[PDB]
Structure formats: structure tokens, C-alpha cells
């Protein structure tokens, strides 16, 4: 149908906008602390602590599968990255501190993306 195509063009454009949002968020992690999944070879007890792991490569795979239906789902994944880190790592660690800075710096980017998504429909 012509409607299914119009919907698909909207998802494609959302994916395009979320890709730019992801790139801007990932720039706020220059140490690449959140780039890849926590290694289960190197932290073998991780899943006993963290039930829903997340990281930027895993978000990118979902994005390119057009697996994000709205910005809320995207934000949920970003929030997982931060919140998992802030639980597993203690306050006085480079990892915790990196998450705090990512949260604070990302807020600005997510604030505007929410306006753009509402604005452009």
C-alpha cells in the first residue's frame, strides 16, 4: 500500500535523525568507555549484576535495523548505558565519572531531539 510506504519513509527519516543523535551522544564519550559491550570474558560475573547490558555498538545495530520506533525507546537504551555503569561501578571510579559526564552532556542533545521529533512529526 501507499500508506505502508509513507510509514516506512517516516521510520527511515526517524532512523536518520536518531543516527545523528547517536553520533552526537557518542562524541560525548571520547574515552570510548561505552563503545562496546562489557566483555563477559573479562567480567565473567557481569550478568549477575546487570540484567540488561547496553552499549553504543549494540544501539547502532538496533538503529540500522530500524529497530527504534520512537525516540522514547532510543532514550531507554541510552539511559541503560548510564544507569548500568553507575550501579556496577563505584562513585570514585573513572567509569562512574564518565557516565555522569555523558548523562549531563547528553541531556542537551536529547532535549533538542525531542523538540525536532515533535516538530517534524
From Swiss-Prot:
Bromo domain boundaries: 9-113
The protein's name: Bromodomain-containing protein 1
Biological role: Scaffold subunit of various histone acetyltransferase (HAT) complexes, such as the MOZ/MORF and HBO1 complexes, that acts as a regulator of hematopoiesis. Plays a key role in HBO1 complex by directing KAT7/HBO1 specificity towards histone H3 'Lys-14' acetylation (H3K14ac), thereby promoting erythroid differentiation.
Subunit structure: Component of some HBO1 complex composed of KAT7/HBO1, MEAF6, ING4 and BRD1/BRPF2. Component of the MOZ/MORF complex composed at least of ING5, KAT6A, KAT6B, MEAF6 and one of BRPF1, BRD1/BRPF2 and BRPF3. Interacts (via PHD-type zinc finger domain) with unmodified histone H3. Interacts (via PWWP domain) with dimethylated and trimethylated 'Lys-79' on histone H3.
Tissue specificity note: Highly expressed in testis.
Localization in the cell: Nucleus; Chromosome
Domain of life assignment: Eukaryota
Record cross-link Glycyl lysine isopeptide (Lys-Gly) (interchain with G-Cter in SUMO2), residues: 41
Amino acid at each position: 500500500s501507499m500508506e505502508q510506504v509513507a510509514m516506512e519513509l517516516r521510520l527511515t527519516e526517524l532512523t536518520r535523525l536518531l543516527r545523528s543523535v547517536l553520533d552526537q551522544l557518542q562524541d560525548k564519550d571520547p574515552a570510548r568507555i561505552f563503545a562496546q559491550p562489557v566483555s563477559l570474558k573479562e567480567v565473567p560475573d557481569y550478568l549477575d549484576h546487570i540484567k540488561h547490558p547496553m552499549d553504543f555498538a549494540t544501539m547502532r545495530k538496533r538503529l540500522e535495523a530500524q529497530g527504534y520506533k520512537n525516540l522514547h525507546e532510543f532514550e531507554e537504551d541510552f539511559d541503560l548505558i548510564i544507569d548500568n555503569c553507575m550501579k556496577y561501578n563505584a562513585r570514585d571510579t573513572v567509569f562512574y565519572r564518565a557516565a555522569v559526564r555523558l548523562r549531563d552532556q547528553g541531556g542537551v542533545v536529547l532535549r533538542q531531539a525531542r523538540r525536532e521529533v515533535d516538530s517534524i512529526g
